[PDB]
Amino acid sequence: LVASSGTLEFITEGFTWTGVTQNGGSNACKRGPGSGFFSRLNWLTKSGSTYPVLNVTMPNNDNFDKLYIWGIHHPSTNQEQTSLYVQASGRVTVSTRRSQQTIIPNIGSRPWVRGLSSRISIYWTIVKPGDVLVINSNGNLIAPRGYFKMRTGKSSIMRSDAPID
Amino acid sequence: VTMPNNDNFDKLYIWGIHHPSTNQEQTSLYVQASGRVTVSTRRSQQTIIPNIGSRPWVRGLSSRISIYWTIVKPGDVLVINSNGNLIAPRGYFKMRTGKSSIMRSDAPID
Amino acid sequence: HRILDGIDCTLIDALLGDPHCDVFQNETWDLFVERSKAFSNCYPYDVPDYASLRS
Numbered sequence: 001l002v003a004s005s006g007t008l009e010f011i012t013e014g015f016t017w018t019g020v021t022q023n024g025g026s027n028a029c030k031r032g033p034g035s036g037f038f039s040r041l042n043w044l045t046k047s048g049s050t051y052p053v054l055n056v057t058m059p060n061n062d063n064f065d066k067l068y069i070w071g072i073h074h075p076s077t078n079q080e081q082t083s084l085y086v087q088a089s090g091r092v093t094v095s096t097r098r099s100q101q102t103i104i105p106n107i108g109s110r111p112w113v114r115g116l117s118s119r120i121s122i123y124w125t126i127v128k129p130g131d132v133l134v135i136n137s138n139g140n141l142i143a144p145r146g147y148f149k150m151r152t153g154k155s156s157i158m159r160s161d162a163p164i165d
Numbered sequence: 166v167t168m169p170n171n172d173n174f175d176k177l178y179i180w181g182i183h184h185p186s187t188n189q190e191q192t193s194l195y196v197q198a199s200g201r202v203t204v205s206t207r208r209s210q211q212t213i214i215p216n217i218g219s220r221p222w223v224r225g226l227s228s229r230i231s232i233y234w235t236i237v238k239p240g241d242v243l244v245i246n247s248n249g250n251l252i253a254p255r256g257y258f259k260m261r262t263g264k265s266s267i268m269r270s271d272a273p274i275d
Numbered sequence: 276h277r278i279l280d281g282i283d284c285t286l287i288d289a290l291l292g293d294p295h296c297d298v299f300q301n302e303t304w305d306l307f308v309e310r311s312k313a314f315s316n317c318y319p320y321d322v323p324d325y326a327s328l329r330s
């Protein structure tokens with residue numbers, strides 16, 4: 001669906017991530033000198049000693065279809081889980097008037113991939129015109145920094161190793 | 166609870182589960198911390214767990230219902246187990262099979 | 276063919292049993308005609324694989 005959109009046009013939106021440290025990056029995701037993260041994601045952590053129910057909203061008013069790309073964090077170990085997000089187990093719930101999803105982290109080891117054996121499950125919600133988003137979570141959200149535009153196009157991905165001319 | 170299908174045709178059951186917006190609402194309605202609903206025939210199974218979260222306000226409510234169906238064949242017996250959050254059925258629908266279908270249209274009949 | 280005009284009901288709603296759709300209890304159709312004028316008006320729901328439960 002991205003391939004066919006034919007665009008990676010991103011309009012950043014200010015959300016209100018209250019009571020959380022934003023911008024967590026990592027050594028896996030090195031951005032030039034020190035740590036970093038996906039440029040279109042925002043890693044929410046605990047603030048000093050706390051992580052509260054987050055409950056932002058984001059109405060869409062423009063005359064077009066918004067695509068939102070947001071994640072969730074699967075820790076390696078029950079202590080990593082609490083060290084960040086403070087609770088026993090997170091929860092993320094992303095909704096429009098019509099749709100609804102609820103992931104739940106799964107605390108556990110994976111194989112070593114660039115120093116890490118935690119992971120990120122990515123997902124997508126699309127809000128039509130005049131709908132609304134409502135992100136909401138007690139822990140573990142890999143939160144969206146805004147949205148991508150969605151065109152209906154004649155476009156596609158294709159996998160080749162041919163040179164271009 | 167449990168409910169044989171002793172006829173000789175297929176019974177369809179529409180049931181569901183309540184996801185509240187807050188734990189205040191949960192404990193109020195269904196007294197447990199976390200619920201669970203498991204509906205099962207002999208041959209198959211589905212356990213759905215609720216998700217206490219805030220959705221768009223819609224006709225007052227920011228809570229939600231999710232809908233599931235089980236089909237129970239003749240002989241096969243239905244079994245509903247839950248410790249909260251359940252939206253139970255009152256019975257079944259006759260399942261016929263035939264050339265009946267659904268079209269989406271906005272043009273008048275005559 | 277025998278046509279049932281759904282008017283302001285979706286077939287799924289009809290089934291579920293939304294107030295303004297109880298006109299339809301027990302009905303039978305060859306072709307069910309879902310109108311674009313149609314709505315829902317009762318506890319807000321989602322049906323995963325709505326797709327299929329209509330079909």
Ligand SMILES: *[C@@H]1O[C@H](CO)[C@@H](O[C@@H]2O[C@H](CO)[C@@H](O[C@@H]3O[C@H](CO)[C@@H](O)[C@H](O)[C@@H]3O)[C@H](O)[C@H]2NC(C)=O)[C@H](O)[C@H]1NC(C)=O
Pocket residue numbers: 077109110111112117
């Ligand atoms: C559960 O078991 C798995 C595998 O048995 C553990 O993963 C292993 O953990 C160690 C410690 O981090 C990793 O060692 C490292 O190897 C790298 C890569 O070559 C080396 O360069 C480093 O200096 C380091 O010593 C090892 O790679 C990793 N192996 C695999 C296959 O993932 C995992 O840590 C265990 N979980 C728990 C909670 O004990």
Ligand SMILES: *[C@@H]1O[C@H](CO)[C@@H](O[C@@H]2O[C@H](CO)[C@@H](O[C@@H]3O[C@H](CO)[C@@H](O)[C@H](O)[C@@H]3O)[C@H](O)[C@H]2NC(C)=O)[C@H](O)[C@H]1NC(C)=O
Pocket residue numbers: 055056057132134187219220221222227
């Ligand atoms: C979590 O946050 C969301 C939004 O950030 C909250 O949703 C909002 O809740 C209020 C109900 O207190 C709604 O107010 C209503 O607005 C309509 C608009 O015309 C009006 O008809 C009603 O009289 C009422 O004032 C509001 O619509 C709603 N917004 C959305 C997008 O759902 C939710 O309540 C928050 N929950 C918690 C626990 O903080």
Ligand SMILES: *[C@@H]1O[C@H](CO)[C@@H](O[C@@H]2O[C@H](CO)[C@@H](O)[C@H](O)[C@H]2NC(C)=O)[C@H](O)[C@H]1NC(C)=O
Pocket residue numbers: 009010011012
């Ligand atoms: C992507 O495209 C937008 C729109 O064409 C670019 O310009 C602005 O983007 C920022 C969001 O970061 C906002 O100031 C506006 O919504 C855009 N302006 C207008 C008039 O539409 C921008 O180059 C690109 N964004 C990024 C982050 O690279």
